[PDB]
Structures are given as structure tokens and as C-alpha cells.
Design a protein around this ligand. Structure first.
Ligand SMILES: CNCc1ccc2c(c1)C[C@H](CNC(=N)N)[C@H]2NC(=O)C(=O)Nc1ccc(Cl)c(F)c1
Ligand SMILES: CNCc1ccc2c(c1)C[C@H](CNC(=N)N)[C@H]2NC(=O)C(=O)Nc1ccc(Cl)c(F)c1
Ligand SMILES: CC(=O)N[C@@H]1[C@@H](O)[C@H](O)[C@@H](CO)O[C@H]1O
Ligand SMILES: CC(=O)N[C@@H]1[C@@H](O)[C@H](O)[C@@H](CO)O[C@H]1O
Ligand SMILES: CC(=O)N[C@@H]1[C@@H](O)[C@H](O)[C@@H](CO)O[C@H]1O
Ligand SMILES: CC(=O)N[C@@H]1[C@@H](O)[C@H](O)[C@@H](CO)O[C@H]1O
Ligand SMILES: CC(=O)N[C@@H]1[C@@H](O)[C@H](O)[C@@H](CO)O[C@H]1O
Ligand SMILES: CC(=O)N[C@@H]1[C@@H](O)[C@H](O)[C@@H](CO)O[C@H]1O
Ligand SMILES: CC(=O)N[C@@H]1[C@@H](O)[C@H](O)[C@@H](CO)O[C@H]1O
Ligand SMILES: CC(=O)N[C@@H]1[C@@H](O)[C@H](O)[C@@H](CO)O[C@H]1O
Ligand SMILES: CC(=O)N[C@@H]1[C@@H](O)[C@H](O)[C@@H](CO)O[C@H]1O
Ligand SMILES: CC(=O)N[C@@H]1[C@@H](O)[C@H](O)[C@@H](CO)O[C@H]1O
Ligand SMILES: CC(=O)N[C@@H]1[C@@H](O)[C@H](O)[C@@H](CO)O[C@H]1O
Ligand SMILES: CC(=O)N[C@@H]1[C@@H](O)[C@H](O)[C@@H](CO)O[C@H]1O
Lengths: 335, 335
């Protein structure tokens, strides 16, 4: 445990809030990348127990706190009012760096899970570009597995322990509200989704014996975790995944049972102003959505699942720390 | 006639040279791109003389000139030395867009040829994403035919005219240099290769009546065109294709006579420092390959062939504007 510091390419002329925060909270990235190679090792890592995720989480909370300022913030029964200006919003990559004398080891095993022994291990002073993408169910704009899609879990036996599925091939999703003022929609190519769910399916089948592997929409709870919720240009999108996370892996093939059109899948999305916050326990009310075409062109780089002679899997999320472990499946701060 | 402009998803924080170049040469990509399609049209096309190809060619020459700077540049008996640092190299998509009031119509007939009449025609302002992949014999990371494999030629009865075989199913190829330092190798699944060459064979049979259709390694001449030459992470790979382009198509079946092992084809590759330039007429000398595992996992999306009882086809290439025509088999700049 140490007190880290962020490094970025933030410009102090951008009125984009991530830059506005990073220019006063981080350090200019340094053209100084010496990755200490090493092949004499055995370090055991645990992506599920690592303070880096916590400090990252905390100053991402600071970022959001002084950037996206809600009109009302209702916490503990007390309502706190302030100004609601819509701002420029799009995540910039943040490197996490260890201070004087403190190093950040690094795993290079391309099939490494997160928990256990790793050995082809390098070392750094600063980490690799990471975007503070806040989302549920679908991990957006992250790293891709260099070889093949991998399953991460603090334990896979525990049905209530979140599964992070690190993908390989990015799945472009295009969410948009056209020029109802709150209704939007997302578009995703169906072929590549069937594709990806056959990889997810067959690996889950590698690690669950010989059973039918169903994919279904989340049980219940708040809209934040029952839908693919994300932020696009300061607007909070809640997009439906009932005709997405939907299919059956049997016989070694995956059969999609979600609806489709022209070879594309369209998610019904809604922009909301009242949001169950991820930082704290409370609700934030924002101003109505801005005028015009509100579109995000994103790439799915991972999944967040939850398990219950058949085994059903369901989109998860809610705890953004696990979002941070998708990219902090780790390193290791060490001395 | 016009001078176009590029549009891309280049990041100003990336130190990858395609991003470095595009960010100062291109325009932030448009995501309001609505194909106003038409159905009372018939326009003629000619992928084999289209100036968009040489605008792209000139611009990619610019990119390579300002990015990959060789230690030595020998042209016309005069040598030019400069600093040759190793860089990060991975092609990003480039949309080519027409300026004010001037448009880019589009062909929609998927069984389309490249030369002649076409009727289902749309029109856009910007082309689809095209990655400037510089290679010979094999076209990498291109678009796939939506339907069935297409044979393209300026004309097919001219044996000196390059033939572009637009594939349907991509064929995965994994070139790697393991941790001799310049010795590398490529892996390709044979069954997929047999499979592809059977309809390459069948349609080349459709265009050449009742001949035995053989596939053999190239002529001779410079290694760039006698080998599958390409660029992986700044390193110039020359890969042997004597056991790849090798087969007999007869009586309706393809027959692979190239050597294999465990059902896989392994190409013998070498990383060279002395390169015959594709941009200009001259040679370039680069620094020795970097340390570590150099891996490129690519998809074969097209072929570059040349024709001579029997008709024989050999891998071609060398002139990269044909590589740009593979993706610019086209559209059209029109008013
Ligand atoms: C089984 N999983 C456990 C689980 C489940 C749900 C949640 C947690 C843990 C933590 C958090 C509790 N806070 C609260 N209830 N007010 C709650 N998450 C959120 O409200 C949340 O992410 N909102 C949110 C905001 C913005 C965007 Cl863009 C977004 F995509 C989502
Ligand atoms: C019938 N065919 C005619 C024909 C034949 C060969 C060539 C041309 C035309 C053009 C070009 C001439 N330039 C020269 N002779 N210096 C020459 N091509 C190249 O040198 C070339 O592609 N190099 C190259 C570099 C890097 C990578 Cl990664 C690569 F895959 C290839
Ligand atoms: C590496 C890559 O781009 N895609 C891989 C593919 O090569 C592999 O065969 C498949 C097996 O699950 O997983 C995915
Ligand atoms: C979720 C998952 O894949 N867990 C496994 C774990 O059971 C195993 O002990 C470890 C070995 O390094 O690899 C990982
Ligand atoms: C994974 C871990 O650290 N602890 C336990 C594991 O040993 C046990 O097998 C499992 C059974 O549900 O519950 C958890
Ligand atoms: C959490 C959520 O939004 N669930 C909805 C469900 O109520 C609805 O019946 C279905 C059909 O559109 O779409 C999904
Ligand atoms: C979610 C579930 O269990 N079953 C759904 C069903 O409700 C829905 O009508 C159908 C349409 O996509 O897809 C399946
Ligand atoms: C959900 C999300 O952040 N998506 C972003 C999008 O806003 C941005 O335009 C694009 C390029 O930077 O990267 C991705
Ligand atoms: C479209 C596809 O995936 N594969 C096609 C197949 O449908 C077609 O019958 C065959 C004919 O050569 O070419 C390949
Ligand atoms: C290489 C090739 O296939 N060429 C033919 C061309 O001879 C013919 O005129 C055209 C008709 O649209 O179809 C194509
Ligand atoms: C097809 C075309 O456009 N031009 C000519 C064609 O007229 C001629 O018959 C052929 C013979 O070599 O050469 C080519
Ligand atoms: C252009 C080229 O590399 N040709 C070679 C050839 O000289 C060699 O005999 C054969 C066997 O490995 O492989 C191929
Ligand atoms: C290139 C040619 O004409 N015939 C080749 C032969 O030279 C080679 O020994 C054999 C092994 O792959 O494959 C065939
Ligand atoms: C020759 C070439 O450009 N190959 C690329 C490879 O480097 C890259 O890893 C992959 C995914 O982007 O696409 C392909």
C-alpha cells in the first residue's frame, strides 16, 4: 500500500471535464517507459484484493464529483441543490504511477486470470492508458485479450461473485438519440454477437462440465444494473439488453433467441435524470437532455456476468471497482 | 477531379504513428453518415482508373515517409542517412471524404466487378473505414464479399494484368518471431486454405472454361513480390509462400500439394533490414529487429494473382494502389 499519483496527456485548454480535472490532479505523462523485464519470479496476484482499485475508485469519484454536478443530490433524506450546467464529457486515459522508491510489477502471461501464480513478469513506474468508463453489464473502451477471451472470478463457484469476461475481438455498439425527447436506441451487429457468445459459451463450458449454458437478462433491481447503463456526452443512457444477453449454448453451438432485424440488434434506450449513484448511496437529479443528435460510438471490450444440469448467466455490474479491475486485472505495487 | 480529405478515429494521445499522422492530417470522423440510396441510376465504374486510389496512395506514402524513417535511404546512387528509432505501428481505418458540394456515390451490387455498369447505387460523403495495410500476395484486414468470392481484373485475358481475388470467409494467419533473431514463421489452418482455394478454383474455372487450374509460387525477381511481404509492428516480414500457393484444381475439386504438418501450414519467414521501396524506386535500410516476441495475428481477406491444357496462377503484388483498389473497388467522386 502506498499513495499513488495519476499521469495523463490532459491539455489545459480543453473545457472537457476529464481534462479540467486531470490538469489539476494528475501529472504530465513522461516519455520515460522502462519496463523492467524479468524471468526469475513467482509473484502471486489477486485482482480481487488490491488497493489500486480503491484509490482509482476514490479519485474517479472526485472527478465525477467536481465535473458532472447534478441539479439535486438526495442523500440520507437530505436534498442538496446546486447549478446544473451541461458540460463537455469524454473519458481520457489515466496512468497510475507509484512514487519515489516504490515500483509497479507487471504480469505478462497472456492467459493469466487475476488470482494466482504468475511469472513472466516485468515492472514499471507508471501504468498503461486507462479510461474511467462508467458502465454496467458492458465494459467499454478497455484492453483486449492478446490471445483468447478469458474468464475472471474471485471464485467461479460463488454464484454471487461477479464474473468479469475479458474479450478479444471488440464489439462496436452505436448508441444514439435522434435530432420522445428521452427515447434513444443502440445498434449492434448480430453476427459478431453470436460469434462472441460462442467464445464466452465454449470457455464457460470448459469451466462448467457438460451442461446447457443459458444466457438471460438480469433478474431484478434498479435500472442501473438491470440495463446497460452508461454515460454519453453527459447524458445518462439506460439501454435494454433483453434481446441481447439471450441465448442457449448446447452441443458446442450457441443459438441466439433474442429478436433481430436486417442482421442487426436494436436496444431500446431511455435517457434518465434521476440516477441511483455509483459513488455513494443516494440519488442524483440532472437537467433534461441537451438538444440535437446525441450519439456514442463505443466498443465492447468485456462483459459483467452473474451465475445462479443447466446453468444460466446474467449481465451484472453496479460496483464500478470491478469495472476498474477489468483494466487493473493488474500489475502489482511493490517495494 | 477533386482533392479529398481523410476522416478517422485517431487519438492525439497515442504514440502510434498512424494516429500521430492522422491527427494532424485527417479530420475527426463523422458519425452522421446517412447513405441516401437511389434506384433509378445505372452508372459505370472503373476501379482500375480512379484517382481516389492515387490520392490515398500519395497520402499513405506521406504517412510512411513521416513515420517509418529508415537508417539509410539509397536512391539513384545517392544515400541519405537519418535517425531510425523503432516506433509503434498498427494501421487504423481511414475514411476518404469529398469536400464541399462534391459527393461520393456508391455501389451496392455486391456481385459487382469493379468495371462496368451498376444500378443499385447509394451516395455518401465519406467512405467506410480502410486500414492502409501494405502487403504483397495476400491482402490483409480488408472487407469481405458479403455473398460469394469475386474475381476482379482490368482485364482477365491479359496475363500481365494483376487479378484481385476478393474473398468471402477470412483466413486467419499468425506470423510470429519467438523470444536466429531474424528468423520467424507464419501459421495457417490448412482445411480453411483448401476450402478457400476450391472456390477461388471453381470461379477461376467459371471464367476459364474447361482448363486444369494450377496454383504455383511466383516467377522470381525481388523478394517483396516473390514472398508474402508485410509490416508487423514496424518490422518488415518476408514470408515464404511455396507451400501455400500450391495446388491443382481439376474435375471440380481442388487438390493441395503444398506441404503441411498436424493439419497446419507453416511459412518460413525472415525479417529483413534491406527493403526495396514500394513508395519510390530505391532501397531502405532499417535498424535490426526489436527484442522479444513479435506477433501479428491477421485475417486474409483477399488474394493478388497473375496468370501466365492448363492455366497457372501465381501470387502477385508489388504495386500498392492495387492494394487500395481492393477496398476501393469502389464508389465514385461525382457531382
Ligand atoms: C450485485 N451488484 C451489487 C451492486 C448493485 C448495484 C449497486 C452497487 C452494488 C453499488 C451502488 C449502490 N449505490 C446506490 N444504490 N445508490 C449501485 N450501483 C449504481 O447505482 C450505479 O452503478 N449507477 C450508475 C450510475 C451512472 C452510470 Cl453511467 C451507470 F452505468 C450506473
Ligand atoms: C508486375 N509487378 C510490377 C511491380 C513489381 C515490383 C514493384 C512494383 C511493381 C512497384 C515497386 C517498384 N519499386 C522498387 N523497385 N523500388 C515494387 N514494389 C516493391 O518494392 C514493394 O512492394 N516493397 C515492399 C515494401 C514493404 C513491404 Cl511491407 C512490402 F510488402 C513490399
Ligand atoms: C486471437 C483472435 O483474434 N481470436 C481468437 C481466435 O484466434 C481463437 O481461435 C478463438 C478460440 O476461442 O478465440 C478468439
Ligand atoms: C476463475 C478461474 O479461472 N480460476 C482459476 C483457478 O481455479 C486456478 O486455481 C488458477 C490457476 O492459476 O487459474 C484460475
Ligand atoms: C475460492 C476461495 O477462496 N474460497 C472458497 C473455496 O475454497 C471453496 O471451494 C468454495 C466453495 O463454495 O467457496 C470459496
Ligand atoms: C429491466 C427491463 O427494462 N426489462 C424490460 C421488460 O420489462 C420488458 O418486458 C422487455 C420487453 O421490451 O424489455 C426488458
Ligand atoms: C428473457 C426470457 O427469459 N425470454 C425472452 C422472452 O421473454 C422474449 O419474449 C423473447 C424475445 O426476444 O426473448 C426471450
Ligand atoms: C461510452 C464511451 O465513453 N464511449 C466513447 C465515445 O464517447 C468516444 O467518442 C469514443 C472515441 O473517443 O470512444 C468511446
Ligand atoms: C457466404 C458464405 O459464408 N460462404 C459462401 C457460400 O455460401 C457459397 O455457397 C460458396 C460458393 O462458392 O462460397 C462461400
Ligand atoms: C473480370 C470480369 O469478371 N469481367 C467481367 C466483364 O468482362 C463483363 O463485361 C462484366 C459485365 O458487367 O462483368 C465482369
Ligand atoms: C477487354 C478490353 O478492354 N480490351 C482488350 C480486348 O479488346 C482484347 O480483345 C484483348 C485481347 O488481348 O485485350 C484487352
Ligand atoms: C523466393 C523464395 O524464397 N523461394 C524459395 C525457394 O528458393 C526454396 O527452394 C523453397 C524451399 O524452401 O522455398 C521457396
Ligand atoms: C514449386 C513447385 O513447382 N513445386 C513444389 C516443389 O518444388 C516443392 O518441393 C514441394 C514441397 O512443398 O511443393 C511443390
Ligand atoms: C498486418 C496487420 O496490420 N495485422 C493486424 C494486426 O497487427 C492487429 O493486431 C490485428 C488487430 O488489430 O489486425 C491485423
Amino acid at each position: 500500500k502506498t499513495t499513488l499519483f495519476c499521469a495523463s496527456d490532459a491539455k489545459a485548454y480543453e473545457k472537457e471535464v476529464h481534462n479540467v480535472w486531470a490538469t489539476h490532479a494528475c501529472v504530465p505523462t513522461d516519455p520515460n517507459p522502462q519496463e523492467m523485464v524479468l524471468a526469475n519470479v513467482t509473484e502471486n496476484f489477486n485482482m480481487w484484493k488490491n488497493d489500486m482499485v480503491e484509490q482509482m475508485h476514490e479519485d474517479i469519484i472526485s472527478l465525477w464529483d467536481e465535473s458532472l454536478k447534478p441539479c439535486v443530490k438526495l442523500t440520507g433524506g437530505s436534498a442538496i441543490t446546486q447549478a446544473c450546467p451541461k458540460v463537455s464529457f469524454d473519458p481520457i486515459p489515466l496512468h497510475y504511477c507509484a512514487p519515489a522508491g516504490f515500483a509497479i510489477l507487471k504480469c505478462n502471461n497472456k492467459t493469466f486470470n487475476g488470482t494466482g501464480p504468475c511469472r513472466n513478469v516485468s515492472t514499471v513506474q507508471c501504468t498503461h492508458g486507462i479510461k474511467p468508463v462508467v458502465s454496467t453489464q458492458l465494459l467499454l473502451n478497455g484492453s483486449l485479450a492478446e490471445e483468447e477471451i478469458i474468464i475472471r472470478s474471485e471464485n467461479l463457484t460463488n454464484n454471487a461473485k461477479t464474473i468479469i469476461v475479458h474479450l478479444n475481438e471488440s464489439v462496436n455498439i452505436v448508441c444514439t438519440r435522434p435530432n420522445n425527447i428521452r427515447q434513444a436506441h443502440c445498434n449492434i451487429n448480430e453476427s459478431k454477437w453470436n460469434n462472441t457468445l460462442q467464445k464466452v459459451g465454449e470457455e464457460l463450458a470448459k469451466h462448467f462440465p457438460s451442461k446447457t449454458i443459458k444466457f438471460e437478462p438480469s433478474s431484478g433491481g434498479d435500472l442501473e444494473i438491470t440495463t446497460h447503463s452508461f454515460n454519453c456526452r453527459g447524458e445518462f443512457f439506460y439501454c435494454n439488453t433483453s434481446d441481447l444477453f439471450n441465448g442457449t449454448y448446447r452441443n458446442g453451438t450457441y443459438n441466439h433467441t433474442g429478436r433481430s432485424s436486417n442482421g442487426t440488434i436494436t436496444l431500446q434506450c431511455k435517457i434518465k435524470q434521476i440516477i441511483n449513484m455509483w459513488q455513494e448511496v443516494g440519488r442524483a437529479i440532472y437537467a433534461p437532455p441537451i438538444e440535437g443528435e446525441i450519439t456514442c460510438n463505443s466498443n465492447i471490450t468485456g462483459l459483467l456476468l452473474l451465475r445462479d444440469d443447466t446453468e444460466t448467466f446474467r449481465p451484472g455490474g453496479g460496483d464500478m471497482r470491478d469495472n476498474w479491475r477489468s483494466e487493473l486485472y493488474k500489475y502489482k505495487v511493490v517495494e
